[PDB]
Symmetry: C5
Subunit: 203 residues, 5 copies
């Protein structure tokens, strides 16, 4: 008993299908928690970054009658088992290295939360990393195949308290804003949240 819910939640479920529903796009809440700026290649213009990626959305195919399943309040599912935002780091110059277990938490109302810790390298102008002005990196994320009307990317207060106390670099400033733009190819507009970080070398 108890987890005959997994048998159910994955019965007629195709993880390749964005769980939208007539007119209304699936809205995914995105937020980036900067944890550390590992390195800066001044010669090739890249930053090695470690961060928490906070994503949540609602999959209507994934809800259940809390009755029929007694104590089951939430379930920990493998992201390979359900649909997940196909977010992409636009300016990344390296495959993303996901450091935590690829599990997602699912609510009895179908609310999903996937919170992977990641290390990835981005293309960035790290010129003034030694000036008082510092260097500014723009970490741009957004769905890769779903446009505004299919997947609505919404941001939400970026956390900065995870930032490592020691660390060769100090955070001069941080901002996060979502945008919508058209691309050479692809007819529709694409929403994207961009985490902008300004940092300088301590001392």
């Amino acid at each position: 008993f108890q987890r005959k819910l997994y048998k159910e939640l994955v019965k007629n479920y195709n993880p390749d299908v964005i769980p939208t529903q007539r007119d209304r796009p699936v809205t995914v809440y995105f937020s980036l928690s900067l944890l550390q700026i590992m390195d800066v290649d001044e010669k090739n213009q890249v930053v090695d970054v470690v961060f928490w990626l906070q994503m949540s959305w609602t999959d209507h195919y994934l809800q259940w009658n809390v009755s029929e399943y007694p104590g089951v309040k939430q379930v920990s599912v493998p992201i390979s088992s359900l649909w997940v935002p196909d977010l992409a780091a636009y300016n990344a110059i390296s495959k993303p290295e996901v450091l935590t277990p690829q599990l997602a938490l699912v609510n009895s109302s179908g609310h999903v939360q996937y919170l992977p810790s990641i290390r990835q390298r981005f293309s960035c102008d790290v010129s003034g990393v030694d000036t008082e002005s510092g260097a500014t990196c723009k970490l741009k994320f957004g769905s890769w195949t779903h446009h505004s009307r299919e997947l609505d990317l919404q941001m939400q207060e970026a956390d900065i308290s995870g930032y490592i106390p020691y660390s060769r670099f100090e955070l001069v400033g941080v901002t996060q804003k979502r945008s919508e733009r058209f691309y050479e190819c692809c007819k529709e507009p694409y929403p994207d949240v961009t985490f902008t970080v300004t940092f300088r070398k301590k001392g």
Copy 2:
């Protein structure tokens, strides 16, 4: 959704190992390379590390549907492992290709597939004059690995250069893209290949 019984259909009698050529008609795939950055240049070993968007599109007749039978379904985002994809290859690459974006293609209700993966790969290139005013010239040659002219028709299309990183140790002196058809030792037929030629020099 509610109407994605379309995926169940699109993959029913579908073998992704089968090039969708419809009799006496080679599948024509449109190819274009958007140079984003020239990461490094190994002058000692003659290689360039390059990052680029790869724009490919073609038509899979097995993948079309009656827009009626499936109400609001205009297009679908499918895993490239689920359908046939051009077996393009970097003839002069000296490293496996590292695909940076989600491996998904967009499929039209008329069977038009689009696949734009961002890739980082190293190529064999004579980077001698990367410091001269002439600059170094790298030829990134791509082409279908096992399908010849009559099976897969590689067509190019205006290469985009606006994606190029503004900062970056290197500046783009020149860029050209042209498709060709050749004969190779072995393989009876001729194979088409689009070659992106880039000339760049170190700024300052």
Copy 3:
């Protein structure tokens, strides 16, 4: 002893994605870290390369059997991909964990699972005073990643230090291990965590 129709049974109605709880009964997993070596210390980027032996054990009620019905079968060696395993995570790790040993767990006839993977992983750590007599102190924090206190109860147990390599550029000034319960920004609940604190200094 042949009669391994037990594996057929142990994996019949078994979903490894399901944490083996039982109403108001969290699965308690015993965790312990045996430090084997401190490979390197990046003073520039603040990281430590560490090789350790994680000792984990817990009870999966779905995995017990009547020792009668299966004669000589005392225990079984199963692939961790075949059963539920604590989704422990290195909270301060800056690299994917590289597991060096076969990913097999041992299972008791009473459902007691043992899993002791040897691992090499890099952690974020202030390795400033690695040359001072005080030494540097690294905190290796582990904890479930998706299950809170009431679902998975992380319990520690005497950390072993005898595995530490005799030679090695570094000597162990001190070691402590303690479990805690904290709340995080997001996730409404408490997630227990055992933290292995190591203080080491460069020999000579």
Copy 4:
């Protein structure tokens, strides 16, 4: 018109070497040297990039050209059929295959597999700076199938693929197949060995 794939993979086990009574499967092997990436003089290794040209005949893979109209050949994933389990006896790194792992199959069952590969080999690169140059022996051969199961035959090695620029110039190249017995393994195992002699330009 590809119900041929459905057929070609029906009662087909890619783990079974396509032999017949007292008839070893003969695979034609040839290496096209494309580039000598690097040379570690301290550890004695060469980084090499090359085209491997393999062909053989799989009798399970032929069809009546009639029953399948225009189908002259098919491009199949090597995971779908049997492929020589060749190994680089002296490689010190896993092989990195750079091209799509697809093979071409004839209507008569003739298979062709041409994978571009980058791999590192153990080699005495001492005299890479002398006029004599360094000589590397790239030895390949079936890993589990002996002479009577898999007959490795060589064939004129191509050298025109060699990169014009490149820190190194090709002083000499030879390719020869051999048969030997090893410590263990009762039977003799054949192997084609590509020997390259190169020196640093200038």
Copy 5:
């Protein structure tokens, strides 16, 4: 040949996760290491990069057949993923093992299996005196990870040293191989292990 309806049979009621033991009869596996090369030595981190042939053989009673019912079939080349294989582990390795050859073992008509992987792996080792005449001594310890003495009996056998590379920055001062049995902190039973000890020094 062919008559490979033998593979269909050999894998019918076969679970590769089941050690082919049998009531008071541990499966005995013969292990031997052929040192081919000592790639590098990190004196700062105390590690050795090594390339070796691991020679393993054992008997799987589930894998035998009536040589009659299958005419010319003397032996078969099977993928190790298809049958049970000793879960040997390099107790003191600090890197995942990189297997360089095709992962196939050969199987006798009497059930005798032979796996012969070539491997490159890094081990924790005190490479202090690699420049002294005494040389450095590395102990490569292997052993089953989850099966104790009574389940899997590890037996050694004359280590081969003729595979050692003639050139190479290092020369072999000495080589010895011996199996042992111990009891460990945890795990009730005793576990057997073969340890390849190599002493080498820098040439010249």
